[PDB]
Design a protein around this ligand. Sequence first.
Ligand SMILES: O=C(O)c1cccc(O)c1
Length: 318
Amino acid sequence: EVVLKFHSFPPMPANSNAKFVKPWSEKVLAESNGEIKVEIYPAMQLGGKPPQLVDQVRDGVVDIVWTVAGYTPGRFPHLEAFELPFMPASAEATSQALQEYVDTVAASDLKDYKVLAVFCHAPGKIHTKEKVIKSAADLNGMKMRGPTRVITKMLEGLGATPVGMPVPAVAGALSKGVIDGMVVPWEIMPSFKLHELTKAHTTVSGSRGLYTTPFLFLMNKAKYESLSDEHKKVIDNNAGLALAKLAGQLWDGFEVPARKLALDAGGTIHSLSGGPLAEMKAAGEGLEKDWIKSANDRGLDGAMLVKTAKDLISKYDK
Ligand SMILES: O=C(O)c1cccc(O)c1
């Protein structure tokens, strides 16, 4: 018998716990004949703040984490390419792209971990208390939360005043008037009542969504290496590209009930097209250009990484 401590920041009802890590742990339990037991600690129940999850798993404080890569700026620089404006297709396609990217050109970002999967949410949407966002200009003066440095820079480039914070802080920042809105996909919102606190929602039409942000599902390397050959095989049968594909499929599906909750609560949903959409995409090109230069400055071939990311997304877009 092996006990593995899983740690993450969302509360127990959040999809990442209840509909991803919990069934993963049940499949791992079943396929190891009750021998590999994951103990799930949501809501930072083993201590620390969300950016520390990667340190905890790296150092063996815990054995497995689910987190947002960009909650620790600069630590996973290759993955930033997938956060650039208008990169994501479905979570299913974009998650497989992320995993193959990490398996190949971006492996150095995660060399200190056992990678279970890297994947992402369905494209994020724009949420405000009441003001409909029809164009970039409607964001002028609005304090808008994003999850990572790349996404806050996108918000600045669309005219907003960016504020960064992990998602559990958003509701309080809204109710206290510290932010006027945020970007998140639908799926995370009900776990924090965010569809009650924002009634105006904007998405984009077409085949590339506003943004996504990579999730990391990681195991401590030494702990993985200590497992028996048979236990490694159970873990690996529940890791890699197949898991990233399943995760992306799940995250696409998670949008559906969450969107319905938001509209049932009195929300509006507006979908940018035409001129307003083109204006946002043109603004995004500026961030893409500056990101490529910033990757160059950090020793990466920024142009090659952006091309690779785009090509992998389209490869898996079926
Ligand atoms: O925007 C985020 O920080 C976030 C965190 C967890 C799940 C998710 O869909 C989004």
